[PDB]
Amino acid sequence: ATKAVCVLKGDGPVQGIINFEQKESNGPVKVWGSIKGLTEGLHGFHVHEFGDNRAGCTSAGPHFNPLSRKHGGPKDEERHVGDLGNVTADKDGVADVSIEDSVISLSGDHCIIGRTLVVHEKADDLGKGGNEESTKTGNAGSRLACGVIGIAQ
Amino acid sequence: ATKAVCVLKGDGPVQGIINFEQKESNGPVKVWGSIKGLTEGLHGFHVHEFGDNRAGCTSAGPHFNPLSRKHGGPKDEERHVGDLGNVTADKDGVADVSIEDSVISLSGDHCIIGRTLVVHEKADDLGKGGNEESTKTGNAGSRLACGVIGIAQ
């Protein structure tokens, strides 16, 4: 079964480790791990297009949107491949991520190996945020921590 | 025409950006960038199996060697997929990289997207160092800096 990992780092306190497992190449991907350094609440959680961190998290480019669709939440039909919603940080800044998704893959055209997982400033509004920006990125703000999704043992 | 990038970081001063380019599937991967923070001289430049950075450059694991060959130099027929030889740091610690390789690839069985590049402590002796370890790892020492090979624009 195909396995991947991401180590999230950025410029301040935000850090963590996000595992990915996909036992069948057409089943869902299990995403799990933990993030610390976070303000309490909901934090946008997106696969970005490039595994490029050469000038920081900015280098990662836009959401991974191969089907040129509009931004949604995970559960929507209309959503980018890399729209994985929000993760929620507790009062002590810790987010226990647990997610199952059937739009991302670890193989094929929807493959997220070598792309970037990014944790954002604020809530992804999930297309339901009442302005232009909402239906493009979900207004989730600055990129706090990222890293490239890599092949794991 | 496919592109990748690796940003090299470690616990020391060694930093670098390395670019990969393979304009067609069967063709050679062009590799180039710069690494600073190195001691003058030669340093092993290897692709390792895992894009895992969980516990630093150690988590990358072993040389990327899908064909189960002995360690050599890039020009050798007998070599690991990940055997890219050595880069040369000048007196100011700067290593200008320019490499063309036909064994690594950006797609396929020999695909290196999502794996790690590591730059090592000491010269790779290229399997001609004349001891056991020569033909496993080439004696290149500790891992100074690594980064996961990600998709680039």
Side-chain angles (χ1 to χ4, degrees):
Chain A
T2 210
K3 253 254 149 100
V5 54
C6 191
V7 181
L8 274 11
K9 305 268 131 192
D11 286 328
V14 184
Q15 54 199 307
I17 304 157
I18 300 290
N19 294 296
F20 302 75
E21 187 164 70
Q22 194 182 24
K23 282 168 183 290
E24 58 252 306
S25 64
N26 50 199
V29 182
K30 308 181 154 201
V31 18
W32 77 99
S34 188
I35 311 154
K36 69 223 283 253
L38 252 4
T39 53
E40 204 166 6
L42 235 42
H43 290 276
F45 187 76
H46 301 136
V47 188
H48 287 253
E49 200 185 347
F50 304 127
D52 185 355
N53 189 63
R54 84 177 78 189
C57 293
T58 264
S59 287
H63 302 164
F64 181 38
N65 191 17
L67 312 176
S68 296
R69 287 177 105 184
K70 296 184 288 75
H71 182 58
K75 277 141 136 214
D76 301 349
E77 176 50 23
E78 187 71 359
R79 67 155 264 194
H80 305 146
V81 166
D83 290 339
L84 308 153
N86 287 291
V87 293
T88 311
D90 68 25
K91 55 157 134 68
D92 290 315
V94 175
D96 175 82
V97 184
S98 218
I99 288 176
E100 251 164 68
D101 198 82
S102 299
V103 182
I104 66 163
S105 199
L106 307 185
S107 45
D109 330 75
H110 284 188
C111 188
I112 66 167
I113 287 163
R115 281 162 204 297
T116 290
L117 190 69
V118 171
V119 64
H120 289 269
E121 178 175 33
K122 293 171 192 270
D124 184 7
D125 68 30
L126 317 170
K128 266 129 183 154
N131 55 41
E132 198 77 37
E133 195 35 27
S134 185
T135 209
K136 317 169 159 185
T137 72
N139 299 308
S142 94
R143 295 172 196 209
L144 301 193
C146 55
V148 190
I149 302 165
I151 290 171
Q153 188 159 12
Chain B
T2 214
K3 278 248 226 154
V5 70
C6 182
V7 186
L8 285 33
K9 283 182 172 86
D11 295 310
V14 179
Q15 304 186 7
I17 307 172
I18 307 297
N19 294 296
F20 297 80
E21 181 156 86
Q22 185 175 38
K23 286 249 157 222
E24 62 256 325
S25 117
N26 59 300
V29 182
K30 254 217 193 138
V31 17
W32 75 105
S34 192
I35 313 176
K36 72 224 216 276
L38 260 1
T39 72
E40 192 170 21
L42 245 26
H43 298 271
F45 194 68
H46 300 132
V47 187
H48 294 246
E49 178 164 4
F50 309 115
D52 185 347
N53 189 55
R54 214 185 298 247
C57 294
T58 283
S59 326
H63 283 223
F64 175 50
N65 186 29
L67 291 175
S68 303
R69 287 154 154 249
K70 270 156 331 199
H71 176 77
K75 278 179 141 266
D76 299 346
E77 154 88 351
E78 204 62 19
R79 73 165 260 187
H80 307 159
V81 177
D83 280 352
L84 296 167
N86 289 291
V87 303
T88 308
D90 70 17
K91 65 219 174 88
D92 302 311
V94 179
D96 196 47
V97 184
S98 224
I99 285 182
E100 205 161 86
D101 200 78
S102 265
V103 174
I104 61 177
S105 162
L106 294 185
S107 54
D109 280 354
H110 284 182
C111 185
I112 56 167
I113 283 146
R115 302 195 188 274
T116 298
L117 192 74
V118 187
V119 63
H120 292 265
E121 197 202 345
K122 290 157 72 81
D124 183 12
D125 65 29
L126 322 166
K128 280 158 192 70
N131 52 35
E132 185 158 328
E133 196 44 45
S134 181
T135 236
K136 312 173 175 141
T137 73
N139 287 297
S142 84
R143 304 183 185 187
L144 289 193
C146 50
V148 184
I149 313 163
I151 304 138
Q153 190 152 31

